Each structure stands twice: as C-alpha cells, then as structure tokens.
Amino acid sequence: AVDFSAHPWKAPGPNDSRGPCPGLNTLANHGFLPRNGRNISVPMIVKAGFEGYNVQSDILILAGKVGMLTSREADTISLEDLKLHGTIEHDASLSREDVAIGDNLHFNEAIFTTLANSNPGADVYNISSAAQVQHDRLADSVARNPNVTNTDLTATIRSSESAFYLTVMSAGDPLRGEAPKKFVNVFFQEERMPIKEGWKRSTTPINLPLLGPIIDRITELSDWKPTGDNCGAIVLGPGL
Amino acid sequence: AVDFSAHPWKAPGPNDSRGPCPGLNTLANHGFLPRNGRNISVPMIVKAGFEGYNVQSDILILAGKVGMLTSREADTISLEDLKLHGTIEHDASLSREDVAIGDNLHFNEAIFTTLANSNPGADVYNISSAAQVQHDRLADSVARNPNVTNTDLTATIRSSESAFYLTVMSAGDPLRGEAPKKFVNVFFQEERMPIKEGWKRSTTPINLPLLGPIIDRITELSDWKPTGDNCGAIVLGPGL
Ligand code: HEM
Ligand code: HEM
Ligand SMILES: *[C@@H]1O[C@H](CO)[C@@H](O)[C@H](O)[C@H]1NC(C)=O
Ligand SMILES: *[C@@H]1O[C@H](CO)[C@@H](O)[C@H](O)[C@H]1NC(C)=O
Ligand SMILES: *[C@@H]1O[C@H](CO)[C@@H](O)[C@H](O)[C@H]1NC(C)=O
Ligand SMILES: *[C@@H]1O[C@H](CO)[C@@H](O)[C@H](O)[C@H]1NC(C)=O
Ligand SMILES: *[C@@H]1O[C@H](CO)[C@@H](O)[C@H](O)[C@H]1NC(C)=O
Ligand SMILES: [Mg+2]
Ligand SMILES: [Mg+2]
C-alpha cells in the first residue's frame, strides 16, 4: 500500500537531471525515482513504475534496457541521458521539438497545443484523438524538419507513448483507452501526478497485453506512412 | 591485482550456460564469471574482463548493455542468451556456423579451419591475416547462406571480435595487433586461458582508443563492401 502522501511532488532543483519522458520525470518529481534523476537502474524503474502507476515489469524491462544504452555507465542512466536522438528519442514528439530544428529535451507549450486542443467537445482524450494528434505532429515534422526520421520503429514508440498517457492517467479503468484532459494536462505541463484533481493509481495492472491493442488501434487510426529508407536502426551508445 | 591461481580452468558441464562468445565463455570456465554461466550483469562482465584480460570498462559497458537486450531479465543474462541472432550474434563468425544453415552457438572445428590456417609461415596471427580471414568467411556465407546478413554494423562487430583475439591473447604488447597462434588456438578450441603455454594477462589496458585503429585497419584490409540494404537494425529483445 503505497502512501502517496509520503511521495509529495516537488519541482526539480537546478542540479536535478530530467529527460524527455514525462513518465519518468513525474516519478522522479514524486521521489518514486531519486529526486536528483541520477544513477537510475532498470530494477529501480521497474519498482517505481509499479508503485507509482501500476505499470508492470514486461514493458519496463524492455524499454528500460534500451534506455540504458544512452549512458556511459554499466547499469544506470541519468534521466537527461534519454534525450539521445535515435535510441528512443524521436521526432514528432507530443510536447518536445525535433532535435534538428529545436529543443528535444524540455516541455514546450507551443508544441503541446496540438494535444491540448484535441478531442474537442469531450472532457477526455481517447484513442481516436490520440491518433489525430500523432498524424498532425508527424505532418508538422515533415513540413518543417528536412532531417525528419519516421519509421516503423519510431511510429510504434510514438503509439506506445500515447497509449501510456491514455492508460496511466485514466479515471481508473485503463482498458477504456481514455483519460481525463484535466489529468493528462497536469502530467505533461507539470510532470505531476494529479492527486488534488482526483487521480488515483490504476488498480488494474498496465502490461503489454493491455497496451498492445491500444497501440495498434492508435497506429491504425493515424493514417500513417513511413519516410525514406524506413530503417529501424537504433543508436547503440552516446558519442558514436 | 588478480589471483589467477584462484581461477583454475574447468570444462563446462552439460547444464552450464555457454554462449557464442569465446571471451565470456573463457571467463566463465575460469570462474571470473559464474561457472554456471547464469545471472550475469554488466558490472560482473566489466570486473571479469578487467581481472582476466585487462579489458577496460568503456568497451565492456557498450557491448555488455547491448548483450543485456538478449534476455527477459531486468539486468542479467545467461551466456547462452547471447546467441540471439541479429542483436550481436551475426553470420560469418570465425568459429560458429550461420544460424540459417547450422549451429550459431557452439565451436565448430570445420569453420575454424580458415582462421587456423591463416598467416601461413608465421607463429602469430596479425591484422592482415585477421582481415583475410574475415574476407574469406564473409565470402563463404554469401556463397552458402540464402539469408546472409552483412551490414556496416555486422562488419564492425566482426572486426571488433578479431581485434579482441589479437589483443587479449597477445604476447604482452596488445598495440602490436598480433598474437601467438598457440595462444589463440587454445582460446577458441578449449575456451581456456593458455597459462601453461606461457600466456599472461596484458599489462597494457585494452580500451577503445587502443582497439579502434586495429578494428578500422582490419576492416580496410578485408576489402569490405556493402552488399545490400546495409540496414544496421538490431533485434531489441527475445521473441520479437
Ligand atoms: C522503461 C522506462 C521508460 C523509458 C526508458 C522511457 C523513455 C522515453 C523517452 C526517451 C521518451 C522521449 C521520446 C520522444 O518523445 O522523443 C519518452 C517519451 C514518453 N514517455 Fe517514456 N519512458 C519510460 C517509461 C514511461 C512511462 C512509465 C510512461 C508513463 C506514463 C511514459 C510516458 C511517456 C510519454 C507520454 C512520452 C511522450 C513525450 C512526448 O511525446 O512529448 N514513459 N519516454
Ligand atoms: C562486453 C561483453 C561481451 C559481449 C556481450 C560479447 C558478445 C559476443 C557475441 C554475442 C558474440 C558472437 C558473435 C558472432 O560471432 O556471431 C561474440 C563473439 C566473440 N567475442 Fe565476445 N562479447 C563480449 C566480450 C568479449 C571479450 C572480452 C572478448 C575477448 C577476447 C571477446 C571475444 C569474442 C570473439 C573472438 C568472438 C568471435 C567468435 C567467432 O567469430 O566465432 N568478447 N561476442
Ligand atoms: C552514477 O552516475 C554518475 C554519472 O552521472 C557516475 O559518475 C557515478 O559513478 C554513478 N555511480 C554511483 C554514484 O553509484
Ligand atoms: C473519442 O471521443 C470522441 C468525442 O466524444 C468520440 O467522437 C470518439 O468516437 C471517441 N473515440 C473512441 C475511440 O472512443
Ligand atoms: C542472482 O544474482 C542476484 C544478485 O547478485 C542474487 O541476489 C541472486 O541470489 C542470484 N540468483 C541465483 C539463482 O544465483
Ligand atoms: C602479418 O604477418 C605476415 C607474415 O609474417 C606478414 O607478411 C604481414 O606483413 C603481417 N602483417 C602485419 C599487419 O603486420
Ligand atoms: C531465406 O532466403 C530465402 C530465399 O533465398 C527465403 O525464401 C527465406 O524465406 C529466407 N529465410 C529467412 C529466415 O528469412
Ligand atoms: Mg522527441
Ligand atoms: Mg555468429
């Protein structure tokens, strides 16, 4: 029984490491991960994701070990390391700019406008709105970034990230693939768990069987096509 | 420093986990890594490679974290996990068969014949012989394997592996890029440190600055050329 009162939100300090991921940033901001954002292992991510969000080890082990590639350390990262373009970090993010034409690390309100204005007339974001947002963000990158990378891999990662905001920030049934806008907006804009606002950790485990169909449905509805070579190669370490 | 007398060679039993890598298998056979070949983390690899071979953390962290992708565990592998084709394990190996046409895991004497007969007339293997062997092994895979994969990435990994046998099994000066055949043959054929034969751990650290030029020279002298998509995508986990 995690006591969320024992995990208060605190804004990061000047020497706290933060990355392009609102999920991990939010866990650090509540002390489920180290508040300094440093020396974070995959076991630590597994535990934090379980405690904070009820996200299970299947997805966190897979994504965590890919994330470990971004650091120079044997078995840890700093959250900022995860900005390394072409490992996980990709163009056509929901709340960050493309690395070739801007800042791929920090929350950007102008970029976030697209998500914030989605699913007009409803009080939730859902699978169809998530797909529309992905379509529109990719169109923006294609229009403004001549170095855009858009592949089967990046498209799948992008749908995974949309599935995450729809499930982790849901009103309590992640299967629904819908989340209150008031929760998701706090998650992105403040990297805070919207506890005041009425959010509670899912009592349903969020695992790959739960996320998989949501991911695939978002992709299907997004009118997606690859760009260029469609090469699914990742960057294997920093510096290279 | 390191007590090699506390690290005797013992042949693996039928249940001991062993992989396609003679470097890690040899460390396990001397107990620098667990003799059962299981529950191995990147920190353990870093320590074992330092103690056994004077290989430094830079290369072992980079390679080790890519190797961790081959298991389902948060921060460990079994050595056999590393056989996963298309993460690190590749066609045109020095001592193993290609997975599409044979056994990509165990030492194979028929395959090893090419390396064993290289640098005729000399008592060492060196950079030019290593390059010739790589050329010949790739030609063999191209001739006989209808699913052969040959990319910039696999070529670089193959040259890295050649650089490893030339440096770790050297007669004490790894910069020379040459190793006694009597040492290298024991390393491959027995996965044993050739201590009775007169081998000693390098007193010179083996790191990426040392290996990089050897790797690049081997590639250069092998007359390597791209043969197709040349898409350097790795497999990011088992079962995918
Ligand atoms: C295994 C652990 C994790 C790793 C290594 C990781 C890594 C990343 C990285 C590198 C990005 C930036 C990609 C980009 O937009 O360019 C990202 C984005 C994202 N992550 Fe995570 N993540 C993890 C876990 C989670 C969790 C548990 C959530 C839960 C809500 C989450 C939600 C998101 C979202 C919504 C984005 C999109 C941000 C945007 O498009 O602006 N992640 N993640
Ligand atoms: C960082 C840790 C290591 C990992 C994860 C690793 C992984 C691997 C893998 C998966 C292979 C098989 C590739 C193939 O031939 O298809 C391989 C081959 C090889 N490794 Fe390692 N290795 C590591 C460290 C070392 C060390 C310290 C040496 C020292 C001599 C070494 C020497 C070799 C050699 C010579 C081969 C070629 C075998 C052949 O072509 O038949 N490795 N390694
Ligand atoms: C943690 O990460 C830093 C790099 O940010 C590294 O220098 C340090 O050795 C790591 N280890 C600790 C403090 O356990
Ligand atoms: C998303 O919500 C909108 C507005 O209520 C609705 O028209 C649409 O059908 C919903 N889509 C899904 C997948 O529920
Ligand atoms: C695996 O290694 C961990 C960490 O060192 C240890 O706690 C555990 O007992 C090991 N398990 C086995 C099966 O040896
Ligand atoms: C390798 O050894 C052979 C035989 O002694 C020699 O001809 C060749 O020049 C050597 N190559 C290098 C790079 O030393
Ligand atoms: C191997 O290549 C043949 C064509 O020569 C193809 O029919 C077969 O599907 C390939 N197998 C794999 C594992 O891709
Ligand atoms: Mg991005
Ligand atoms: Mg192989």
Residue numbers in the entry:
A (entry chain A), B (entry chain B): -3 to 236
Quote the study that presented this structure, word for word.
High-quality large plate crystals were grown in 10–20% (v/v) PEG 4000/0.2 M (NH4)2SO4, and the crystals diffracted to a maximum resolution of 1.58 Å. The electron density maps allowed the whole polypeptide chain to be modeled, from Ser1 to Leu236. These monomers are covalently linked through an intermolecular disulfide bridge between Cys227 of both polypeptides, and many hydrophobic contacts are formed among the Val62, Leu65, Ile230, and Leu232 residues in each chain. The heme access cavity is a 17 Å long, deep funnel with a wide irregularly shaped entrance that reduces to a narrow base close to the heme group.
Here, we introduce a close ortholog of MroUPO, a UPO gene from Marasmius wettsteinii (MweUPO-1), that has a similar reaction profile to MroUPO and for which we have set up a directed evolution platform based on tandem-yeast expression. In general terms, long UPOs are monomeric proteins with a molecular weight of ∼44 kDa and with a strong preference toward small aromatic compounds due to their narrower and “carafe-shaped” heme channel (e.g., AaeUPO vide infra). By contrast, short UPOs are either dimeric or monomeric proteins with a molecular size of ∼26 kDa per monomer, harboring a wide open and symmetric cone-shaped channel (frustum) that dictates their preference for bulky substrates like steroids and long aliphatic compounds (a preference attributed to MroUPO, see below).
